[model samples]
Target: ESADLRALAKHLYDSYIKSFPLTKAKARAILTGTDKSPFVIYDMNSLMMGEDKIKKEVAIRIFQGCQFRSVEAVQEITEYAKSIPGFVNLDLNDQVTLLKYGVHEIIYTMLASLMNKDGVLISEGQGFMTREFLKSLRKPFGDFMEPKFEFAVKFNALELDDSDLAIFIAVIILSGDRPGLLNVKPIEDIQDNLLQALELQLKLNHPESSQLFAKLLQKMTDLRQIVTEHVQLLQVIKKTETDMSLHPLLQEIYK
Candidate 1:
C-alpha cells in the first residue's frame, strides 16, 4: 500500500518536536501567533546540523507538505548540483547562490500571476514586465539563495499590481522562513516600499486591478493580526522556559 504522505509528514514533524523540543515550541509559537522571533535560521541550522537519517526524515515531511512541482524541480536541481565535484567544497553562501540561479520558477510564477488578468498573461508581455522588475533588485535573482531575501523582491514587485498581489504577498510573508531578510532593511524603508507599490498599482484605472488591491489590503490587515498574536505567544513561552510535553509522535526524538 502507498504510504499516506500527510500522515508521514506529520509524523516527521512530530519526531522533530521530540528531538528538538525548544525548536518545535518556537515553530509552533510562530505558526500559532505566539512567537514572532525569526524561525528560519533555527530551521536551517536544525536541518544542516542533524544526522543524515534525521535530515532525511525532516526532508520527507517537508516535501510531502509542499508538493508543488516547482519545489520538486528545485530539489532535483539541488541534488544534481550536489553531485558536482566542487559543490560541497563551496561555502554555504556559494551553495545558496547556485541554487538561486538554478531555480527561479517560484519567483517567475508569482510575478506572472500578479501581472495577469483572469490568471493568464501574454508570454512576451510578461517577459518584458519581469525584466523591468528584476532590474530593480540590487542583487540578481540568482544571487539570493535565502527565500526571505528573494521574497522581499517578489513582494515589492507584487505591490506594483493592482489586483490580488497583496493576498499573494501575505501568503508568502506569513508562511515563509523569516531569517536572513526581515531585518536587512530598516522598518521605515520596508514600509515605504510596500506603500509606494500599492500607491502605484492603485493609480492604474483598471477596475479588476483596483478590486484586487483592495482585497490584498484587507488580507494584509488580517495577516498582521495573526503575526502579532503568534509573536506574543512566543514571548510568553520563552519567558516561562518550561518544557511543554509534546505529542507522542515525537517520542523518537526524546529518546
Candidate 2:
C-alpha cells in the first residue's frame, strides 16, 4: 500500500509541476533575468495621479485582467484534476460541482507563488503590483484584493514548491464535504491518499517542522473563510458594477 501511494504521489507531483509557472521565484527570475527589458513594476504613485473616474477605470481593468488570468488557471487546473487516478471517473455533475467550488480555492493557493509581503505579481509577472496600491482602490476592489494578499502573504511562509502544491491542490479538489457531491465515498478515499502523500512529502521536505502538516491543514480552513468573502465580493461587483463583467466560465463557477 505504501508503494502504491508513493507511486501516486510521484504521479501527482509530475503531473502538476508545470501547471502554474508564474510563481514568485519564477516571476522574480523573469524580472531579474532581463536587463533592458526588466519586468515593469506598478506601484501606487506610478499608477495613480488622477481623478475618481480614472481611478475607477484603472481598478476595473485590474479586476478584469485578474478574471481573465484566473479563467486560464481554471482550465489548467481542470486538466490536472483529471489526471488524478479516480477523478475523471466521477460523475460529470460531481466533477462540475467540485470544480465550481474548488477552483477559487486552487487559484488562491497559486496566488501565494506570485506574492510576497509587499504585493503580488500581476500581468503575467511582467508587472509587480503593490499591495498599497490595491488597497487604495475604490470600495469592494480594495476589499476584495486585500484579503487575498493577506492570505497569500501568510501562505507564502509555507514555502511549498510546485511538487508540494500539486498534491495539496488535489486534496482540495477531491474534498468530499463539498456541497452537493453525489458520491462522496470515492472522493473521500482519493483525498485520504492525497493526505498520506502530503504528510510523507512534507515530512521529507520539511524535516525540522513537525507542525508543518497540521498547519497546512489548518490553512484550508482559513482558505474557506477567504473564499466565502470572495464569493460575496464577486456577487457585489456583479450587482453594483454594470460596467465590468466576469468571463462566462467564471460566471458559471461563481453562480
Candidate 3:
C-alpha cells in the first residue's frame, strides 16, 4: 500500500481499537501500519460512529441533529421549487414529506454497510422513518438503490461519484454544527478545504478520482436543485398568505 493509505489505515486502526475495547489486541495488531485487509478497513469505517464508546445519549442527540438538518435542507429546497411561474404547487407538508424521503434514502444507503453479520448491524426499524423515506425513492432513482445501499452496508470501499461527494461535503457542513454527530471535530472552516480538495481531485481526471469527483458534484447539484425548489415554494406560500385582495373566488379560497 502507498504511504498515504498506510497512514490512513494506521490512524483508523488506532481509532477502532481504542473505541472497541471488546476487540482483541490480536485483531487490533493486524491493523497496524501498511497492512491492507478487508477486516481492518471495515472496522475503521464503523469506528467513525464511535461503536466502541457506544454512548446512547450522544448517539440519540447526533441522530436528532442529522434529522433536523435533513428537514432544514428539504424546507430550503421546497421554497425554491415553488417560485417558477406555473410551477406545481407544493406546500410545506409536501416538501417535508419529500425531504424526509430524501434524507431517509441517503441514510439507508449508508446503513446498508451494516447488514452483513461481520460488519456494523443497524437494527431494523431502528431508524424506521428514515429508511421508509429512502425506500420511497426507488422508483425515481432505481439504478442508484442497490449500489448505494450496498456501499453503506459494506466497508467504506465503494467509489463515490460527484453527487455522493457533494452530499458528503454537505453532511460535513451540517455535522459541524452538531457536536457528537460524528467523531470528527465540527469545524466550518474544514468545509472550504474539502471543497478545494474536491475541485482539485476532479481536475486530476484519473479514472478513479474523476469518477469519485463526479459523484460528489452530482450530489451537490442534486442538493442545490432541491434547495432552489424549496425556496420558490416558500415564497409562493408567503405571497398567498399576505395577499388578501383578490377575486371573490380566490379570496374565499384564501380565507
Candidate 4:
C-alpha cells in the first residue's frame, strides 16, 4: 500500500493540486473579486438599512461584488482543468460544456478552503465578514449566501487538504451528468480515474477515517443542491434586478 499508494498520490498531487494557488489569501482574491483591487473592509453589521430603497442598494452591492469576483474564479478553474492529465484530450465543445455547468460547483467546493464557522476571509485575508451580516442582505441575496456558508462550516470539519480537493474538483468537472455534453465516454473515463485517484489519496492520508470517501461523495450532492438553489436565485435577480448587469460568461452559464 505504501509504494503504490504513495506513487499515485504524488502523481495526483503534483499534476492537479499544484495547478491551483490554494492559499487562503489567494483564494479570497479568486473567489471575492479582491484580486485586482482590495475593497475597504466595512462593518456590515453596523451599517443600517432601514429604508426599502437602501436595502435594495445593499443587495445590489453584494450581488455586484460577487459577480465581479466570479469572473476571475472562472478563469482560475479553466486553467486548473487544462492542467489535469487527459482533460485537454476531450473534445473542445465538451470542454466548454463541462466548465459551463461545472464552474459553480467548483467555486462552492473551493469555498470550503477559505471558510469557517464564523465567516469567510475576504479582500486578501484583510477581513472576516460574519455570516450573520451576509444573511441579513435582503431576500435572495441573504438567501444565496447563507447556504454556502452553512455548507462551508460543515465541510471545514472534514479537514481536507489540497490533494484531496484537487482530485475532487477534477471529479466534479469531468462528471458525465453535465447537460449537453458531446462525448460522455471519454469524460466518464477521465472522471473514473480521478475518482480512483481521490479514493487512493483519502486512504493514503486518512486511512483510519472510515467512510470518509462516502462522506465526500455526499458533499458533492450537497454542492449540486446548493447550485440548483443558486441558479433559481439568479432567475430572481434576472427578473427583479433588471439594472444589474451580469457578466456575459455568467449569463451564458446561468441562463
Candidate 5:
C-alpha cells in the first residue's frame, strides 16, 4: 500500500510540478517561457489612454494569469482527491461537497507554498508586484492580499521543500472532517497513513531540522486563521467593489 501511495503521490507532485514556481531557482524562467507575452506591455504607447490605463491593463493581465494558476492548483487537488481509492465510494453528492468547500482551504495552502517575502512572481517573471505595490492597489483589494502574503513569508521561512509540500497538500485535501461529508472513514484512513509517511520523509530529508515536522503541523492552525481572513476579504470585495470582477470560476468557488 505504501508503494502504491508513493506512486500516486509522485504522480500528483509531477502533475503539479509545472503549474507554479515556488522556489527562487526556477521562478524566473516561468515568466518568459520562450514567449514574451507578459512583457508586451512595455512597448505599447496607447497614447490616448494615459499612464493609469496602461498600468491597470498590465496589472489586470498579470492578475488574470495569477487567478488561473490558483485555479489550476485547486483543480489538481480535486483530481487527486477523486483518485483516492475509496473516495468515490461515498455518495456522489458528498464527493462534490468536499471538492467544493475543500478547495478554499486548499487554496490557502497553495498560496503559502507559492509565495515569498518579495511577493509572488507574476507569469514567468515578466512583471513583479512588490508587497508595497500590492498594498497600494485599492481598499479591500489592497488589504485582501496582505494576509496571504504575510502568511506566505512566515510559511516560507520555515523552509519546507517540495517533498514536504507534496505531503502537506495530500493531508490537507484528504481530511474527512469538512462539513457535509456524509462519510469520513475512507478519507480519514488516507490522511492517517499519509501523515505517517510524512514523518518518515522528514527524518530522511531533514535530519538537521529537529522541530520542523511539528512546526509544519502548527502552521496548519495559522493557515486556518489566514483562510478565514481571506474569505472575509473576498466578501468585502464582492459587496463594495462593483467595478471589479472576479474570475467566473473564482466567483463560483467563493460564492
Candidate 6:
C-alpha cells in the first residue's frame, strides 16, 4: 500500500489546528514537591498520601485527570483517523470498534513525545513525574502506569521531533492488525502508506539518529507488548478493585 505521506500529514494538521495556550515554561523538581504543586511527580503513590478523606479526594482528582487526558488524546487520534483516505470507508461500527482498543495504545505512544529518562509529564507536558515514584505506587496504580513509563523511556531514545512523531502515531492507529477488525484491507493499505512515509521522513529529518527507522518499527512491537500487559493487568484490577470505577471510555477499551 502506498502510504500517501501528504494525505496523513494534511489530516493531522487539520486535527491539531487549535493549539493550546502556553503558559510560562515552568521548571522545578518533580519529586519532593507537594501534592498541590503543579510540577509534582505524577505518582499514584502520592495520591494515597494523606488521611482517608484527603487521600481519596486527591487520588480521584489526579486519577480523573489521567482518564480525561487519555480520552482527550484518544479523540485527537480519532479525528485524524477519520480524515485518512480509506478509514471512513469502513463500517461506522467498525470505526468505533477500532477506537475502543486503539485509543489507549495511541495515547501512550503519543505521550512518549513528552517523556525523558526520568518519567513522563502530566497534563500537557508542563508537569513532570519520576519513574521511581510511579514505581512506588501500590499495586494496580503502579502496575497501570509503570509500563507506560518503561515504553516512553525507550521510545524517547529515538529522539523524534513533532513531524516524524506525528507520522509514527498515525502508523500506530491505522494498523489493520487489530483483532476483530472487519474492514482490515483498507487499513492495512493505509498503514503501509504510513510506514513508507514514516521511514522516508526519518531519513530526511533524522539522518543521524542511527537506525532510527528500524528502531521505531521495533518500538511498535515493544508498544504492543506494553499494551498487552496493560490489558491483562487491568483485567486483574477490574476483578478485584470493584469499589473503584474506571472512566466509561477506558472501561470499554479494557473490556
Arrange candidates, best TM-score first: 2, 4, 6, 5, 3, 1
Q: Which stretches of candidate 2 lie over 4 Å from their true place?
A: 23-25, 28-38, 43-56
Report the Cα lDDT for residue 83, model 3.
29
TM-scores for the candidates: 0.24, 0.89, 0.26, 0.83, 0.76, 0.78
Please report the TM-score between candidate 4 and the true structure. Answer: 0.83
Best by lDDT: 2
TM value for model 3:
0.26
Residue pair clashes in candidate 4: none
How many backbone clashes can be found in candidate 3?
43
Q: Which lDDT tens digits does candidate 6 get at residues 1-255?
A: 235565566555444443211111222233224543545454454433422323254434555567788777666677767765666887786787777766777777766655566766665543566667666556666666777877887776666666676676667777787778888887788788777787778877887887888888887777778878877876776687677678786777777
Count of backbone clashes, every candidate in sequence: 8, 1, 43, 0, 2, 1
Clashing pairs in model 5, backbone N/Cα/C closer than 3 A:
30-124, 31-124
lDDT (CA) for every model shown?
Answer: 0.34, 0.80, 0.35, 0.75, 0.64, 0.65
lDDT of 6: 0.65
lDDT of 6 at 108: 74
How well is each residue in 1-255 modelled by candidate 2, as lDDT tens digits?
677767887998777865655644575465444442323335544654322213248789778878888999999899889898889999998999999889889888888787777777666665667778788778888886788888887887887777778889999999899899999998998899899998888888789977898899999987899888988898899889987777999888877
Q: Could you tell me the TM-score of candidate 6?
A: 0.78
Pairs of residues clashing in candidate 2: 24-113
Better of 2 and 5 by lDDT: 2
Native-referenced Cα lDDT, model 3: 0.35
lDDT tens string, model 5, 1-255?
567656655655564564434533355344335553232222234212323432455444445555777677677677667655556777787777777766766677666554566555554444445566666654555675678787777877876666667677767767787787877787788788778767766766789989787988888787778767877866775676566567787777666
